[PDB]
Amino acid sequence: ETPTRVYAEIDLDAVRANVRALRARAPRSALMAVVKSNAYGHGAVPCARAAQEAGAAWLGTATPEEALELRAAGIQGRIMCWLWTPGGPWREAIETDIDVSVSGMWALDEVRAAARAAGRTARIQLKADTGLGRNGCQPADWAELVGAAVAAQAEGTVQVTGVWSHFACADEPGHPSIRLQLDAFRDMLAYAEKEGVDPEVRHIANSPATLTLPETHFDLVRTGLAVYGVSPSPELGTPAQLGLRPAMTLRASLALVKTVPAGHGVSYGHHYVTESETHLALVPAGYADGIPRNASGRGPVLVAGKIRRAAGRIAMDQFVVDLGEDLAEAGDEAVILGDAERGEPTAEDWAQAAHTIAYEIVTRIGGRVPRVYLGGLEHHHH
Amino acid sequence: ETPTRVYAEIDLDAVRANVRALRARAPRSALMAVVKSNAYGHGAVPCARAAQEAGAAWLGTATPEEALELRAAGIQGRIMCWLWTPGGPWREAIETDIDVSVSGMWALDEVRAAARAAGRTARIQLKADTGLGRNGCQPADWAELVGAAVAAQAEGTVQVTGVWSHFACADEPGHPSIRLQLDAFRDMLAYAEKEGVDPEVRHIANSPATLTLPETHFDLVRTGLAVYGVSPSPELGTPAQLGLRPAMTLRASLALVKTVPAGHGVSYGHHYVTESETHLALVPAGYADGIPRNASGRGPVLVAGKIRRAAGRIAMDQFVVDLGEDLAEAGDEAVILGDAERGEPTAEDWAQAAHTIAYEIVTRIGGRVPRVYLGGLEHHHHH
Numbered sequence: 001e002t003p004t005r006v007y008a009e010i011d012l013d014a015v016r017a018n019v020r021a022l023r024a025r026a027p028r029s030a031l032m033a034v035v036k037s038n039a040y041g042h043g044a045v046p047c048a049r050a051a052q053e054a055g056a057a058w059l060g061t062a063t064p065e066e067a068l069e070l071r072a073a074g075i076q077g078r079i080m081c082w083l084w085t086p087g088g089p090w091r092e093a094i095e096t097d098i099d100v101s102v103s104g105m106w107a108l109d110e111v112r113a114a115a116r117a118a119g120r121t122a123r124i125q126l127k128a129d130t131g132l133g134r135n136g137c138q139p140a141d142w143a144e145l146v147g148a149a150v151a152a153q154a155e156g157t158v159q160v161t162g163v164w165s166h167f168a169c170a171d172e173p174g175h176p177s178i179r180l181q182l183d184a185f186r187d188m189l190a191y192a193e194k195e196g197v198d199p200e201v202r203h204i205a206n207s208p209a210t211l212t213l214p215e216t217h218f219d220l221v222r223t224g225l226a227v228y229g230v231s232p233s234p235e236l237g238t239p240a241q242l243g244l245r246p247a248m249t250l251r252a253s254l255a256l257v258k259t260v261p262a263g264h265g266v267s268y269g270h271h272y273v274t275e276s277e278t279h280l281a282l283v284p285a286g287y288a289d290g291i292p293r294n295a296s297g298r299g300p301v302l303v304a305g306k307i308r309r310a311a312g313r314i315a316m317d318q319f320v321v322d323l324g325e326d327l328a329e330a331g332d333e334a335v336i337l338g339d340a341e342r343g344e345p346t347a348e349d350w351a352q353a354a355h356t357i358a359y360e361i362v363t364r365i366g367g368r369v370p371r372v373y374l375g376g377l378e379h380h381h382h
Numbered sequence: 383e384t385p386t387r388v389y390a391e392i393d394l395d396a397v398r399a400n401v402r403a404l405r406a407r408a409p410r411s412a413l414m415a416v417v418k419s420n421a422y423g424h425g426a427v428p429c430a431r432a433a434q435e436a437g438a439a440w441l442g443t444a445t446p447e448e449a450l451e452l453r454a455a456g457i458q459g460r461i462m463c464w465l466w467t468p469g470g471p472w473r474e475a476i477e478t479d480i481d482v483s484v485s486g487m488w489a490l491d492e493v494r495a496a497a498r499a500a501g502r503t504a505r506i507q508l509k510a511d512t513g514l515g516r517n518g519c520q521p522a523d524w525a526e527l528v529g530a531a532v533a534a535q536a537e538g539t540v541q542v543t544g545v546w547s548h549f550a551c552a553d554e555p556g557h558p559s560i561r562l563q564l565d566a567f568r569d570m571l572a573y574a575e576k577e578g579v580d581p582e583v584r585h586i587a588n589s590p591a592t593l594t595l596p597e598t599h600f601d602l603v604r605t606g607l608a609v610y611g612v613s614p615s616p617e618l619g620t621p622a623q624l625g626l627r628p629a630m631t632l633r634a635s636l637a638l639v640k641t642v643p644a645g646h647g648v649s650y651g652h653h654y655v656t657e658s659e660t661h662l663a664l665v666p667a668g669y670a671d672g673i674p675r676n677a678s679g680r681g682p683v684l685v686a687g688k689i690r691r692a693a694g695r696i697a698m699d700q701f702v703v704d705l706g707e708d709l710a711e712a713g714d715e716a717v718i719l720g721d722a723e724r725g726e727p728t729a730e731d732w733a734q735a736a737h738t739i740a741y742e743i744v745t746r747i748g749g750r751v752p753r754v755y756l757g758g759l760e761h762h763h764h765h
């Protein structure tokens with residue numbers, strides 16, 4: 001029934017509301033709900049169905065496998081994936097009508113052959129490296145790749161449906177690289193559009209860019225994190241101020257509550273020692289479940305009406321908390337992260353406690369943790 | 383057929399070799415292979431099967447669900463799980479002949495009711511908190527818990543098959559807490575025995591205690607990490623020094639290789655800027671796959687014959703490495719973590735880079751990452 005140890009509660013109603021709120025932010029563009037990495041830990045399919053429901057025109061994933069799983073789940077509509085390696089399932093992707101990203105000639109050649117075998121045309125989108133220095137084609141190789149693409153288009157083997165890029169510091173309001181990439185993108189797009197490419201969509205914005213720079217919207221925006229009700233960065237504001245609602249609530253039940261004398265060590269390395277006779281509670285969730293070990297001694301948890309802090313080192317499967325004078329009992333609910341509007345710890349709180357970013361917190365929630373859905377439509381729960 | 387992006391290759395022969403090596407260390411005790419957390423990221427069923435056939439007489443998991451997955455996979459023999467919460471599948475565990483741990487009064491009473499409903503006697507193991515401050519019964523409550531158990535015993539509802547504990551700093555050779563806990567264990571164990579408990583097994587030793595303090599072996603030793611070929615700590619030496627063979631090898635295929643101008647920013651935040659014109663390579667694995675973001679700028683990877691450091695911020699699905707003048711092409715192999723003997727970066731190397739411990743490195747390798755099994759017996763990698 002309802003997991004007795006720990007479980008991740010996913011609110012499909014918060015998801016749908018976030019996508020409606022995000023659509024309103026970029027009224028002139030289409031919305032792509034990025035659901036890679038199991039929808040940032042919330043559950044790929046359920047969240048993809050909910051997103052499409054609230055009005056998402058596109059669905060995006062990193063790997064082909066992720067995109068094929070969406071199709072296999074009966075999801076219709078445009079889907080795009082961009083992280084490819086030589087020898088990937090191009091043919092499978094083409095046959096399921098999935099837009100593929102091309103960054104180098106090696107990719108283009110593999111998609112052209114796969115198209116032949118499939119006896120079908122592949123919808124490809126050209127990625128320009130405007131400054132991030134990650135994936136994508138560099139300005140120096142752009143003219144060549146562009147020429148090869150319009151050539152393959154003529155051979156009826158491919159069809160260039162898009163031209164896109166990705167930001168490096170869009171989450172740093174005001175960073176000089178942002179404008180630099182926006183200009184580099186405008187310039188490389190024009191050169192492509194002048195060489196014979198008529199794109200279906202033009203896109204470069206992610207969640208932070210979408211929430212702050214309307215000049216980056218173009219035809220489509222790729223929103224991942226914001227969809228799950230988490231703010232890209234604190235400099236952009238809290239989900240509340242952003243009009244977003246947190247989709248995930250992580251809950252656990254106490255496994256033990258006992259009294260210990262003063263001077264008693266707690267956990268590995270005994271990095272925590274009780275100050276006086278106190279009450280300790282055992283939370284049965286550890287770093288194997290996604291609770292960062294680097295949050296040792298700082299991780300916030302809500303127990304018995306008050307916020308508690310991880311006591312000492314966080315272990316593989318569990319960690320303790322010092323309830324002090326307060327009392328509680330085994331089976332009592334413990335909220336590790338959820339909604340700030342309900343006075344609970346948040347994804348951002350843990351990011352700060354573990355010296356990382358909110359993106360990693362929600363995304364790394366372990367497979368050992370069951371997910372429970374509420375809201376949305378019944379079929380979303382599959 | 384074989385993962386084109388990233389994958390974990392698990393060497394089942396290394397597993398068999400380690401448990402065999404571990405048994406030679408504690409000749410007069412039974413060995414419990416701890417395969418919780420999906421065998422520390424190596425694959426629970428294949429590893430449980432392998433260790434069993436190599437000589438492990440007991441199997442240990444943290445949760446009931448993990449222990450029941452083993453039974454469901456046809457694994458026979460003694461199995462124990464210790465992380466229970468109210469409402470757990472007591473009835474189901476008891477019926478599948480799994481040894482459960484009881485550290486409080488709430489548990490004891492739930493298992494009694496469960497045993498009655500199953501029409502069978504439950505095998506329970508009493509845990510004593512000798513200094514960890516985690517689970518287990520505090521010394522001052524031992525008397526009462528031991529009292530309620532020997533009673534439930536007389537009613538034929540339960541049978542106390544074991545008494546045990548867990549060390550806080552056995553991985554720190556010569557720590558005063560070690561002896562402190564060992565002493566406490568003997569003392570609490572003795573009391574239990576005197577009041578009526580006849581344990582089938584007495585245990586307190588984990589991997590580090592097993593490799594260092596033979597006086598902690600007792601009847602059973604619970605080894606987890608060492609079974610997979612990784613050392614509990616640099617302080618104890620390297621796997622090679624401990625005579626252990628690493629079982630996991632994380633490999634990836636470059637997704638791109640390109641030349642970039644001098645002074646070009648790399649990844650989020652631009653925390654890395656090329657010092658000159660150079661070749662950049664994209665490794666298609668990121669923190670969603672288990673590569674810690676905390677190793678940004680430090681995590682080692684073996685590419686084109688040399689060890690390279692993560693250039694800048696590590697992302698959710700990938701990260702970049704600067705190859706300098708060297709050349710490589712999309713599809714070429716990169717070893718993220720493997721065997722130092724093969725000249726590859728290791729679990730410890732990454733533990734250092736991410737300011738954490740090797741335990742968390744191997745364990746958090748994601749589900750998005752496929753596992754390929756080599757060696758062992760064919761039927762082992764069927765699940």
Ligand SMILES: Cc1ncc(COP(=O)(O)O)c(CN[C@@H]2CONC2=O)c1O
Pocket residue numbers: 034082166205206207208222223224225226232359697698699700
């Ligand atoms: C190419 C691309 N587009 C869009 C997104 C969506 O971004 P948001 O989640 O910010 O809306 C991502 C995710 N980028 C991530 C997130 O964390 N690490 C990454 O590489 C991406 O890689």
Ligand SMILES: Cc1ncc(COP(=O)(O)O)c(CN[C@@H]2CONC2=O)c1O
Pocket residue numbers: 315316317318416464548588589590604605606607608614741
């Ligand atoms: C109760 C218990 N027994 C045995 C083991 C196996 O120990 P080794 O892996 O050191 O051999 C562990 C380790 N559990 C882990 C591992 O890391 N943190 C923990 O709490 C444990 O918690």
Ligand SMILES: [Cl-]
Pocket residue numbers: 486487488
């Ligand atoms: Cl109790």
